[PDB]
């Protein structure tokens, strides 16, 4: 009701396309490292043979703030266009 529960912060699982992943994570973790800081959250990268899903652990306001940036990259142009 008011008090008597173990658990404060929260953890959400962001869903991103394996295509954007490499873009988000960055050169062996060079870009994603900035977010964790700017958002002060615990971002965990998925495996190599698993589905593309980032895990963010933190307050219900921080973890949700980082997710926005992550997906944001999906639209942000990062790389050449000419095939």
Swiss-Prot record:
It is found in: Cytoplasm; Nucleus. Phosphorylated. Residues 9-70 form the KH domain. Ubiquitously expressed in all the cell lines and tissues tested. Binds RNA through its KH domains. RNA binding protein, may be involved in post-transcriptional regulatory mechanisms. This is RNA-binding protein MEX3D. It comes from Homo sapiens. The lineage of its organism: Eukaryota, Metazoa, Chordata, Craniata, Vertebrata.
């Amino acid at each position: 009701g008011s008090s008597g529960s173990s658990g404060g912060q929260t953890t959400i699982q962001v869903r991103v396309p394996y295509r954007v992943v490499g873009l988000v994570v960055g050169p062996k973790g060079a870009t994603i490292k900035r977010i964790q800081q700017r958002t002060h959250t615990y971002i965990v990268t998925p495996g190599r043979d698993k589905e593309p899903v980032f895990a963010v652990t933190g307050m219900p306001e921080n973890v949700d703030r980082a997710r926005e940036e992550i997906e944001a990259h999906i639209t942000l142009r990062s790389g050449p266009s000419s095939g």
